[PDB]
Every structure is written in structure tokens, then in C-alpha cells.
């Protein structure tokens, strides 16, 4: 009946159209800050000296960018890992030139996303559910942490975090391959397996359930109207689906336990994306993909190239050209 | 920027034509029930 207890009750209420919760109390403002700053920087921010070499890169629409090329540009290499809030700048003019908004956006977003994952725990508890949906979302979350926070920490500069834009993303990928040979790293290969397999099993499961829908409708109506929200009976025949799939391959390569199946569906891409987030996060400390450059040589010692050496030729061309003005000494050590 | 000038009409019709189509179908669905 007391003021605080009433507030606590609204915060944690399961009647709010959108659940708030204690994690929401941090999430709502941090995401709003990040979103507003991003929308405005994407449209109107002046160019940013990402690499600290007084060579501003234009990222916003009003400075000659389209949707594909635009980006909020990472903060200056001259700042490195230093905290650069607005109030640390002599002016907004300075803060804009040096990449201030990237830092504001990504810190608020990492906080708000972290709270997003907590909020998934919290509502699950209020509704009497099992709790581990938030564990599934920790795979995408870890991946964002890796490219916005972990990789900058290991390389010493937010200027090497991932730009918030479409082409910026591709720039990050090409530079990453040249320096870490990420294609040749097992954790990236597992990530592709998690993501290709995720797409595969998505299609499989959707096709098998769709294939064994029980006839409930006429040909003139969407079969979707054969299911009513909250009906107790299943809407497909799982034994017919098992009977099809077990014969398509062989019997014991098919699930007939729906719980094991759906757990499988959860586990495969989650685990694969954990590894690929861990791959980024460990190449942050320069433990790179396998190097087989010149591993094969002949009886005399001539190098016999393999596909790995051809990769390396590509990698070199990415190496020698990236940040073409930023390097004064012969090794790009970070 | 020196963009293709028909890009604007391309984009406007690309949005407008199929959207209008969907709206026509939805509204006449609602006046049925």
C-alpha cells in the first residue's frame, strides 16, 4: 500500500503490454539513448577521423552516403581505449570529429542488450516458465560484445571495433581476415557449421511439421486456419513425420521425441555461435587461424603451393592496402 | 550526389504499388465480417 511497494508492483507487473522489470529499468533508457544517438549520427554526423591520422571518413547520409555505405564511424585511434564522453571534449564539434558518438552508442547498447538478456530471465520467472531462453540469446549477445568491446580491448583501440554500418561491417571482415586468417580458424568454421546447420534444421523442421499437418481445412482456405491458438491437441502427426524422415535416411537418425528434437534445435546454433564469438574474442589476443604458408616443399626445398598459400596471396593484398596512410613501420603489430 | 534521377520514381512506385495492393485486400476483408 506504500508508495514504493506500488512502484515495485508496476515495474514487475505481468499486466504491462510490454514487460518492464528491474532489468528493464536499466534497459529502457540505455537503448533509447543509443537509438536516438544512432539515428541522428547516421543521418547528420560530420566525418570522423577513425584512424587518428586526420583523414576524416564520411559516414552519414547528408554527407554523401546511401544506406549501404553509411555508418556511424568508430572513434579515433588517437583516443585508443580512453573513455571519451561528451563532457571530456572542449566542444561537440571536437567530440563529433573524433568519433564521440560511436562510444556513446555502443556502451549504451551493450548495457541495454545485457539488460535485455536479464529481462528474458525475469519475465520467465514471473510467468512460471523454465528460465533458459536467456541462455540462447547469450550467443548473439556474446558476438556483439566480441566485435564492439573485446576485439578493441585486445587491439588497444575502439577504432578497430566494428563500424555501425553495412559497408563498415564488410571492412571489418576483410581487415580481420588479413590479420587473423579467420577463415582458417576452427572457431569460425564451427560458427559456419552452427549457422549453416541452423538454417538447415530450421528448414527441415519447418518442412517436416508442415508436411504432416492434419487435414482440417478445405482447399480454398489457408491450412493455417486448421490451428486455433490454445487448442490442446497437436496440429500435426509426429509419427508420420518420423515415419517419413526415418525412411528418408534410416530409422535411428530421426527423432520421435519432440523434446529432444527441439532441444537439439536450440543447442546446435547456440553452441556454434558461442564458438564463433569465442573465435573473435580470442583472435582479439592474436591467437590466429592455422598458418600453412609454405608447409609443403619438395625434395630440393622448392615451395609447392597449396590452396592455403593462395589464400595468403589474397590476405597480403588485403594487408598491404588497408589503412593505406596509417602505417609508418613495416609490421602492423596491432 | 549525382544519383540516377529515375531512382526516385522507381523507389516511390516500388513502395506504393504493392502496398496499395495489400491495403485494398485488407480493408475489403474487414468490411466482410
Amino acid at each position: 500500500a506504500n508508495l514504493w511497494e506500488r512502484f515495485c508492483n508496476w515495474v514487475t507487473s505481468t499486466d504491462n503490454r510490454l514487460y518492464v522489470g528491474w532489468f528493464g529499468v536499466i534497459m529502457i533508457p540505455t537503448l533509447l539513448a543509443a537509438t536516438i544517438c544512432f539515428v541522428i549520427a547516421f543521418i547528420a554526423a560530420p566525418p570522423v577521423d577513425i584512424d587518428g591520422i586526420r583523414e576524416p571518413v564520411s559516414g552519414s547520409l547528408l554527407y554523401g552516403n546511401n544506406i549501404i555505405t553509411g555508418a556511424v564511424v568508430p572513434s579515433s585511434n588517437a583516443i585508443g581505449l580512453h573513455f571519451y564522453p561528451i563532457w571530456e571534449a572542449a566542444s561537440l564539434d571536437e567530440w563529433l570529429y573524433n568519433g564521440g558518438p560511436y562510444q556513446l552508442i555502443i556502451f549504451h547498447f551493450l548495457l541495454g542488450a545485457s539488460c535485455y538478456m536479464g529481462r528474458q530471465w525475469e519475465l520467465s520467472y514471473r510467468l512460471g516458465m523454465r528460465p533458459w531462453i536467456c541462455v540462447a540469446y547469450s550467443a548473439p549477445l556474446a558476438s556483439a560484445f566480441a566485435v564492439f568491446l573485446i576485439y578493441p580491448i585486445g587491439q588497444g583501440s575502439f577504432s578497430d571495433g566494428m563500424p555501425l554500418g553495412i559497408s563498415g561491417t564488410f571492412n571489418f571482415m576483410i581487415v580481420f581476415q588479413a590479420e587473423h586468417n579467420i577463415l582458417m580458424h576452427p572457431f569460425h568454421q564451427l560458427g559456419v557449421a552452427g549457422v549453416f546447420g541452423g538454417a538447415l534444421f530450421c528448414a527441415m523442421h519447418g518442412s517436416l511439421v508442415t508436411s504432416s499437418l492434419i487435414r482440417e481445412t478445405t482447399e480454398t482456405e489457408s491450412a493455417n486456419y486448421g490451428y486455433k491458438f490454445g487448442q490442446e491437441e497437436e496440429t500435426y502427426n509426429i509419427v508420420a513425420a518420423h515415419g517419413y524422415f526415418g525412411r528418408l535416411i534410416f530409422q535411428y537418425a530421426s527423432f520421435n521425441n519432440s523434446r529432444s528434437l527441439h532441444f537439439f534445435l536450440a543447442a546446435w546454433p547456440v553452441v556454434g555461435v558461442w564458438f564463433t564469438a569465442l573465435g573473435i574474442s580470442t583472435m582479439a589476443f592474436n591467437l590466429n587461424g592455422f598458418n600453412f604458408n609454405h608447409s609443403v616443399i619438395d625434395a630440393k626445398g622448392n615451395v609447392i603451393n597449396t590452396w592455403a598459400d593462395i589464400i595468403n596471396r589474397a590476405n597480403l593484398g588485403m594487408e598491404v592496402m588497408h589503412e593505406r596512410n596509417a602505417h609508418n613501420f613495416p609490421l602492423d603489430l596491432a | 550526389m549525382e544519383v540516377n534521377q529515375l531512382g526516385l520514381i522507381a523507389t516511390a512506385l516500388f513502395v506504393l504499388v504493392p502496398s496499395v495492393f495489400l491495403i485494398i485486400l485488407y480493408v475489403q476483408t474487414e468490411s466482410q465480417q
Partner: peptide, 30 residues
């Protein structure tokens, strides 16, 4: 004109979000 077009579309998507959430067909049980 291209900036206006890009922002116009983006803004239509945010408005659609509002309607899809607050003005959805409510799910009713059985």
C-alpha cells in the same frame, strides 16, 4: 532527394512497428 527517401522509408517502418505491436489482432484462446 535521396536522403529524404531513405529517411522516409525508415520512418514508415518505425510507424509500422507501432501498429504491429499496439494494434495487432489480439490472440484469443480456443
Amino acid at each position: 532527394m535521396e536522403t529524404i527517401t531513405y529517411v522516409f522509408i525508415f520512418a514508415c517502418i518505425i510507424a509500422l512497428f507501432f501498429f504491429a505491436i499496439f494494434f495487432r489482432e489480439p490472440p484469443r484462446i480456443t
